[PDB]
Design a protein around this ligand. Structure first.
Ligand SMILES: Cc1cc2nc3c(=O)[nH]c(=O)nc-3n(C[C@H](O)[C@H](O)[C@H](O)COP(=O)(O)O)c2cc1C
Ligand SMILES: Cc1cc2nc3c(=O)[nH]c(=O)nc-3n(C[C@H](O)[C@H](O)[C@H](O)COP(=O)(O)O)c2cc1C
Ligand SMILES: O=C(O)c1cc(=O)[nH]c(=O)[nH]1
Ligand SMILES: O=C(O)c1cc(=O)[nH]c(=O)[nH]1
Lengths: 312, 312
């Protein structure tokens, strides 16, 4: 039996990694992910200059998941580049970096700086087009003209295969339009579905008050709230972009949800809220539960059922 | 202690009604809603001609809510007009009718027929701009130019106050742009937030198969999945649309959830998934639980806390 994944010119010991933004902001975070049993890791969505993010409280754990308005707290692109160039142990596992410039001009400058490091070390880019928590910064992925611009400029400046983190879509026309944009960019080699469900609102009935401080209580939803939306997006892009990989992100707490994501088309599976709750020990448990499920079904590799969800 | 709601010319005994599409397609269904302790009721979203809807299975109850791809099964607009003109007992409670023409022209023909019945009986219109389950028919509320055309043409054709059933939004700019459109139409007196979270995907791990037949398993999500999104939309439009009412729909299973909607800004509270699960006896329970919360908090009327959620 094998959980191995061969994509992007690497072998991954297994399909699992952190969701961007969870256990990946500091060198300590990145160390703990690296020493984890995860198949991979991705660094926090970073910006050209450092950010401290939004005021507190900006995260709230819920029975069904999470709400967050972190505000892109990050140590700045130079930290993540130095990590990727100097610190990270590639014999342990491949590294992704997430980048979330707040304008096309900022993204261009950042990805340009990654090029030499990708060439030397094999560091992979995930471009974040779906941050829902910086005030006055709408989600790029909900604007297909803007999205086309970022993909054009990043394809030109970076010039190497990369991936995109997408916001959830909820309409077939949007799947169609998103894919038509993504299919115009041959350098877009994977699509991560999905970022949090943007701009939810949680209120505490006892004190009649929102639970997070920024944006009048409005923040992105992670966890159990997101699983059906995540599965849909994964499968929708899996079908519409056959020449690209899809990565699954959303609602994974167990081997079973990972199995569903893979069945829908996911090559890699990212874990956010659950990892924030349980710590990097989850990767060991997820490998065991996924192997258990496969053993029960008599599957020996992921390739036996990846993308084989059945319709009626 | 009072759950009464005074809006749009009518007195409502309590803020509760069914969500469009649940317990409201047949005369029997509407009878059961009328006999219930609900403050009001709404008829199924109807089309000019009858529809049988999507093939089966097209509904699946879930631990955290529902997925449906019903496909607008309805008896046609003449059936619902006839109920509103000849059958419904207005002394019991007011009636709404939801109309979901699949083109602006269809919608126009349908609303023109409603005018004499609204004038005579007080029947209220909710225009559905958010059906996610008819193949080849994208949700109108996700196209702000299309939305403008429908509201223009319906406003002219109907010429009386009406409401709109909106899709959930997940971006602040979408809240702003939707509000900017709605605010150009003074006849739009209320906004229902929200329709189901569109185009989710549920997969059964046991048989590795989707649970609904239409659209490769893709259907609208209801229930616990949608509460934070619903609350956000209610609040967002409550603030941006001071000349209009907001109706809350989504995640309501108890008085506490109802309380949160009202605190977010809701005038009426609709109940979908939970009514499908429990039947119309639920309305007796929701009234009791809301009364209990108001009692504990010392609120004598809904007006004392409607829209008074506290931010930090
Ligand atoms: C605390 C927190 C911070 C996040 N930061 C990022 C980020 O920097 N970049 C990003 O692409 N997604 C970010 N996300 C979104 C997650 O990557 C993920 O898409 C979302 O939580 C859904 O996965 P889940 O249901 O496993 O939590 C963040 C989410 C959380 C909860
Ligand atoms: C079986 C079913 C049928 C529905 N049909 C309609 C409909 O005809 N028109 C409509 O506007 N919404 C319809 N909806 C959406 C609900 O009115 C509601 O917006 C959504 O289910 C969220 O409410 P909930 O969380 O209480 O389920 C339907 C939902 C369900 C579960
Ligand atoms: O840093 C955050 O606010 C953050 C970024 C992002 O992409 N997604 C999210 O849910 N939060
Ligand atoms: O009839 C349906 O499919 C239906 C219509 C609508 O507006 N919302 C929904 O969830 N289903």
């Amino acid at each position: 039996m094998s959980l191995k994944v061969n994509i992007l010119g690497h072998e991954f010991s297994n399909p699992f990694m952190n969701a961007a933004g969870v256990l990946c902001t500091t060198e300590e975070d990145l160390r703990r992910m690296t020493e984890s049993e995860s198949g991979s890791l991705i660094g926090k969505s970073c910006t050209l200059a450092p950010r401290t993010g939004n005021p507190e409280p900006r995260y709230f754990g819920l029975p069904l998941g999470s709400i967050n308005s972190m505000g892109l707290p990050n140590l700045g692109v130079d930290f993540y580049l130095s990590y990727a160039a100097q610190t990270h142990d590639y014999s342990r596992k491949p590294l992704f970096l997430s980048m979330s410039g707040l304008s096309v001009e900022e993204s261009v400058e950042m990805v340009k700086k990654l090029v030499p490091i990708t060439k030397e070390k094999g560091t992979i880019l995930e471009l974040n087009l779906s941050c829902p928590n910086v005030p006055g910064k709408p989600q790029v992925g909900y604007d297909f003209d803007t999205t086309r611009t970022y993909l054009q400029k990043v394809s030109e400046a970076y010039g190497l295969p990369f991936g995109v983190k997408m916001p959830p879509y909820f309409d077939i026309a949007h799947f169609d339009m998103a894919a038509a944009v993504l299919n115009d960019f041959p350098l877009v080699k994977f699509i991560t579905c999905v970022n949090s469900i943007g701009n939810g609102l949680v209120i505490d009935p006892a004190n009649e008050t929102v639970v997070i401080k920024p944006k009048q209580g409005f923040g992105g939803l992670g966890g159990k709230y997101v699983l059906p939306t995540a599965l849909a997006n994964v499968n929708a892009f899996f079908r519409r972009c056959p020449d690209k990989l899809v990565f699954g992100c959303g609602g994974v707490y167990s081997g079973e949800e990972a199995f569903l994501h893979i069945l829908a088309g996911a090559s890699m599976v990212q874990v956010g809220t659950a990892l924030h709750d349980e710590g990097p020990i989850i990767f060991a448990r997820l490998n065991k539960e996924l192997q258990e499920i496969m053993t029960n079904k008599g599957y020996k590799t992921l390739d036996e059922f990846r993308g084989r969800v059945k319709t009626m």
